Design a binder for this molecule. Sequence first.
Ligand SMILES: N=C(N)c1ccc(/N=N/Nc2ccc(C(=N)N)cc2)cc1
Ligand SMILES: [Ca+2]
Length: 223
Amino acid sequence: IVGGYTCGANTVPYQVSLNSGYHFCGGSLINSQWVVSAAHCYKSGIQVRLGEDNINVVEGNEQFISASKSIVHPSYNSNTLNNDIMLIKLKSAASLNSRVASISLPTSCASAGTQCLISGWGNTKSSGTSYPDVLKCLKAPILSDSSCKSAYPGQITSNMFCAGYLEGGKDSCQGDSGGPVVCSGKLQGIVSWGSGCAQKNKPGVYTKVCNYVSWIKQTIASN
Ligand SMILES: N=C(N)c1ccc(/N=N/Nc2ccc(C(=N)N)cc2)cc1
Ligand SMILES: [Ca+2]
């Protein structure tokens, strides 16, 4: 997260770190056994780390639970990042309390202008590289589809939305991928892609979760 702020330990209780020896992507816990992340975060041997703040220090609220299965969206296209969503099932149910909590799926798509919270342990620099150890947060509005499409001609599908700031300076970034965009207490987005980070007229592009709720629910129901 570039231009964000330190969330505060366990203030984003649904935020998970996907760990394969190191943090490589975010995710969002959507029930005790399931995490939603970006399909481009797919890899085998994922350990889901819940209850994280400092991902480099055991601070006492962590739950580390290996994935038992990952399900990449049936229509995920890695070239276009269309349908950049994947479900990860935990081998065991996370223990849910205030510091580790699922985030509600949307019942409706959020509109442009809705303020959201984007979070992650990704790079905090738009130029160069610095990875935070504690969870970073960014309040960012969903941008209009028109501004999104204008920013990224020929790339924004109906399964994507832009959020952030056209002026740049504030954005998610590498290492935030897969993580949440939560708006009014609903998971509306998944950190998906963008050109660089926090670049002018290159806002973050997010998987439009509301399109996937049916798939998520039915997948969970049968897996
Ligand atoms: N909001 C942003 N600017 C932004 C946020 C996260 C981000 N990270 N994406 N990283 C990323 C890495 C690999 C792939 C792939 N295998 N195709 C896709 C995306 C890139 C840009
Ligand atoms: Ca930790």
